[PDB]
Amino acid sequence: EQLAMKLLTYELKNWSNATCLQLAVAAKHRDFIAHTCSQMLLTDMWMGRLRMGRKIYEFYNAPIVKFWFYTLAYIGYLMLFNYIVLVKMERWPSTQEWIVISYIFTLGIEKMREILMGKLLQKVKVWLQEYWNVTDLIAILLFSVGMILRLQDQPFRSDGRVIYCVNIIYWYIRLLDIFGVNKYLGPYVMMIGKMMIDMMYFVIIMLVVLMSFGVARQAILFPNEEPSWKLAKNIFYMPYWMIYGEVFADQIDPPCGQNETREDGKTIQLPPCKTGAWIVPAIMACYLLVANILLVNLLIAVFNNTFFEVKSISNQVWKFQRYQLIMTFHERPVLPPPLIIFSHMTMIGLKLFITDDELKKVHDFEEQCIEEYFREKDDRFNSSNDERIRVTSERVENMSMRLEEVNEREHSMKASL
Amino acid sequence: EILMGKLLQKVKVWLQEYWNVTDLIAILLFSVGMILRLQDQPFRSDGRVIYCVNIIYWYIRLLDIFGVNKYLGPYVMMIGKMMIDMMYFVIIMLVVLMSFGVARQAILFPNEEPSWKLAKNIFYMPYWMIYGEVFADQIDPPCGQNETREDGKTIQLPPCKTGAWIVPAIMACYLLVANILLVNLLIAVFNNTFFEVKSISNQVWKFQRYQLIMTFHERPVLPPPLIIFSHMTMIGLKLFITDDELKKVHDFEEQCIEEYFREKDDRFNSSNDERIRVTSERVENMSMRLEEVNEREHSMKASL
Ligand SMILES: CC(C)CCC[C@@H](C)[C@H]1CC[C@H]2[C@@H]3CC=C4C[C@@H](OC(=O)CCC(=O)O)CC[C@]4(C)[C@H]3CC[C@]12C
Ligand SMILES: CC(C)CCC[C@@H](C)[C@H]1CC[C@H]2[C@@H]3CC=C4C[C@@H](OC(=O)CCC(=O)O)CC[C@]4(C)[C@H]3CC[C@]12C
Ligand SMILES: CC(C)CCC[C@@H](C)[C@H]1CC[C@H]2[C@@H]3CC=C4C[C@@H](OC(=O)CCC(=O)O)CC[C@]4(C)[C@H]3CC[C@]12C
Ligand SMILES: CCC1(c2ccccc2)C(=O)NCNC1=O
Known part of the structure; x- marks a missing residue:
């Protein structure tokens, strides 16, 4: 194991001083990284120096403490x-x-610094791979807009405050990226992200059904209504909440045409209902029979079927992303974003070098490993039942022919005697 | 039971039983409540509240009693195991609920002093939405409009506020996530974990049966209310066997071992892989012997 760890990471003069891990990452070979040896090496790097002036330094520059x-x-x-x-x-x-x-502002400056670390287009193309870093920039831009609006006279300040209130949600949800480090949580987040396509496909059909029901309900009642704009709202408003247990029992089938004396008041005569007002309740049943009991259970079944595959893929992908996380936090400065301005004003490893003898020793060990691998492969191949049956049949056929030749020859001898 | 100078080891062993820790904690809380209840009026009601809160633990303790049943014990073990996944779900649900509540509170009530009600307000309303309550009255209040109502003079409502039409939309997305997305994922997780948890729970309960049986065999006859007399008085599993029976048991064990080894060898030698291996080797040897005879038989032709 120790020699394997040493071999996995060591400068290659021939191959531009690129370790095996870097090449595997470039090849996106998830299996190589997910292997136990690579994971243990990544864990060892994560603990940095502790692995459980100099005393302070070892604690200070370890990536884990910087993450915390x-x-x-x-x-x-x-x-x-x-x-x-x-x-x-x-x-x-x-x-x-x-x-x-x-x-x-300092976090935005640090994002620009990461962008810049004349190839700038390639750097942007690489950076776009991280989907989080795009939403971060968008949220920062919206916050800047809100800040600019908030410092004007009264009519705009409340709009700026509302912008802040809407923006806070993204930063509240951004904690999933932070949780990603945990063993159990990261795969959960990946699965949640994957299920949204099926969720959308369900949403389309639910939207169609809801629109139909809302339009029918609105049209049946309110015959003499001017267009205005409230109709578009009314269509979506009521039916959507019915999915979550609210049925508006008060206004399903109002009494309409009847005598309602009530109490502590004079008798009041209600309007004489309207034509075809008894069709709305029936419709209101069928819709509920479809949105609530039919589609949702189908979605549940879809989740159940997709869970296992998504789980496996998510586990492998998170084990692959661990390396990027570790290196990113190893490169970053010690001081958190609020005080990185000093570090940037100042601005204004992964691989260990090995001696020649150690390099020759590693090469010898690798060659020995290759020889053992090939020998074991051949030994396993030659012990397979199929090969043994094949050899047995061929040798039996040859023996049968030789037996016949001897028998015919033995017949000649009888005449000789 | 603790006492049945090794006392530390006894405590370490005793801590293995998780129930016996909560029992002690509940007893301590009950004693605190009893002490508080016998003082003047200002404390007696606090003692009563302590009793009311404490009763729940004793009401739930019946799961340990149920544990003896064949079907029930594994159910309890599975329930206990699923709580880790429940907690992992709870964390994300809490994040989403906090975000929605803070957004709703901030959008409205612009001129509000900090006080302490805000922390409650954030959690209060959204949590109940998971269970079918949507507060239809106060989703999108009419606000700026004329509301004559009935049996009363006309009343002019406040002219709404800026960005009050964003709360309803948000209120949809939250419900789309908390209710239909995470819960079904939890259901799928339960379905996948059920079989393994069931098997493990069955085995573990079959293992715990022995501890249960011995513990209740050792205990005194009189139930706890009257064990004080037994303790004032204080102030089997294995049967002994004769020599001949011991020799007989040893002979039977040796016979069983011999039969086991013989059966193991018989099963091994009848495997297809071994038979194929032997057949191939013997065929190879026969082929070589056949060739040697054939070459030798060629010599004889010259001899004749
Ligand atoms: C999908 C299955 C399981 C539905 C089970 C229940 C439905 C059959 C019930 C629930 C509500 C009922 C409705 C509630 C109110 C009315 C008004 C009622 O109007 C009248 O009969 C008076 C005017 C007239 O038609 O003469 C007609 C039946 C209807 C639609 C009821 C018919 C049956 C409904 C749809
Ligand atoms: C995970 C994070 C987002 C923590 C949760 C966010 C807020 C719900 C918490 C964090 C700190 C809390 C504050 C801590 C201190 C105070 C001042 C305090 O008010 C007083 O001192 C006056 C006391 C009175 O008059 O009653 C109580 C509310 C407030 C703003 C608390 C309200 C809720 C806050 C903002
Ligand atoms: C996830 C999918 C399936 C949602 C399906 C239904 C939603 C699209 C509906 C449900 C409640 C509706 C909201 C209810 C009330 C209002 C206030 C309304 O405000 C105004 O238009 C007047 C002021 C203005 O903006 O000029 C804007 C739409 C909104 C958010 C409605 C827009 C559409 C919503 C979010
Ligand atoms: C840009 C990433 C991050 C981060 C991500 C995970 C853990 C800690 C910090 C952030 O989003 N905000 C504070 N500074 C940062 O670098």
Whole structure:
């Protein structure tokens, strides 16, 4: 095992000092990375120096501690954001909002720094591979728009506040990326992401049925109604909530034409109903029979069938992404985003080098491993039942012919004697 | 039972039983409640509330009693096992619920002092939406409009607020995720895990039967209410056998071992793989012998 670990990572002068892990990643060979040896090596790197001035340094520059510090900074920023949104804001921002804005601005600067680390188009193409980093940029742009709008006169400030309120949701949901590190959680997130296509295919049909029912209900009643714009809302509004247990029992089949004295009041004569008002309830049944009991159970069955395959694929993919996570957090500076401005002002390993004797030793070990592999492969092949049967049949055929030749020859001898 | 100088080892062994820890904790809470209940009025109701909260543990403790039944015990074990997956679901549901509640609270009530009600308001309404309550009254209130109503003078409502039409839309997406996406995933997880958990639970219960039986064999006859007399008085599994019976048992064991080895060898030698291997080897040897005779037979032709 130790020699395997050493072989997996060592500079190759012939191949541009690229270790086996880098080549496997470039080839996207998930099986190689998912192997136990590579996973153990990645875990060893994750713990950095601890693996359980110099005393401080080993703890400080380990990737795991940097990950924890970044996570804590993010959590604090999130807490401040919540406090800001809930409480009233004056004309000028408070200290908390200044801190939040500075954090966002520095994070955007750090994203630009990652972009730049004349090939810029290739760098952008590579960067687009990370889907999270696109939504992050979009959310930052929306936040900047909200900030610009919030500092104007009264008519715009509330719009800026609403922009903040809508934007907070993305940052609240971004915690899935942080959770990704956990063994159990990451695959769960991947499966959740995968199921959304089936969810959308269900949604289309549900939307069709809901539109039909809403249009029918709206048309049956309110005969003399001007177009306006409320009709489009009314179509979608009521039926959508019926999926979740609200049936509006008050206004299913109103009494309409009847005498309703009620109590503590004079008798009131209600309108004499309308033509074809008894068809709405019946329809309201069929819709509920379809949206609730038919499609949802089908979706459940689809999930059950897809679960196993999605689980396996997600596990392998997360084991593959571990390496990118580890290297990304190894490269990053120690100070969390709020204070990385100093690191950027200052701005303004994976592989271990080995001695010649060790290189020759590793080469010898590799050749020995190859020889053992081929010998074992041949031994397994020659012990297969099919090969043994084939050899037995061929040798039996040859023996039969030789036996016949001897028998015919033995016949000649009888005459000789 | 703890006492039946090794006391640390006894405690370490005792901690293995998870029920016996919660039992002690509940007893301590009950003692605290009893002490509080006998003071003046301001504390007596707090003691009563302590009793009311404590009763739940004793009501749920009946699962241990049910454990003896063949069917029930495995069910309890499976229920206990599924809670990890339940927790993993709960974390994500909590994240989504917090996001929705904070958004709803922030969109409305712009001029609101911090106080402490906000933390409640965030969690309160969204949690119940999972179970069929949508608060139809206060989804999209009419706000800015004329509402004469009846048996009353005309009342002019506030002119709504900016961005109040975004809350309903959000309220849809949340419901589309919490209710139809995560729950069905949890159902699928349960379906996949059921078989393995069932088998493991059956085996584990069959293992725990012995501990149950011995524990209740050792205990005194009188139930706990009257065990004080037994303790004041305080203040089998194996049968002994004769020598001849011991020798007989040893002979039977040796015979069983001999039969086991003989049957194992008989099964091994009748395998198809071994027969094919022997056939091939003997055929090869026969072929060589046939060739040797044939070459030798050629010599004889010259001899004749
Ligand atoms: C996972 C993260 C997002 C934590 C949850 C976010 C918010 C729900 C929490 C985080 C810190 C909390 C605050 C901590 C301190 C205070 C001040 C405190 O108000 C008072 O001091 C006045 C007391 C009174 O008059 O009653 C209570 C509310 C508030 C804003 C709390 C309300 C809810 C906050 C913003
Ligand atoms: C899919 C299956 C299982 C449905 C089971 C229940 C339905 C058959 C019930 C539920 C609600 C009922 C409706 C509730 C109210 C009315 C108004 C009622 O109108 C009248 O009879 C008076 C006017 C007239 O037609 O003369 C006609 C039946 C209808 C549609 C009822 C017919 C049967 C419905 C659709
Ligand atoms: C996930 C899919 C299947 C959702 C299906 C139904 C939704 C599209 C419906 C349900 C409730 C509807 C909302 C109910 C009320 C309103 C207020 C309405 O506000 C206005 O148009 C007046 C002010 C203005 O914007 O000019 C805008 C649409 C909205 C969010 C409706 C738009 C469509 C919604 C989200
Ligand atoms: C850009 C990624 C991240 C991050 C991601 C996972 C864990 C910790 C931090 C962030 O999104 N916000 C704070 N700084 C960061 O680099």
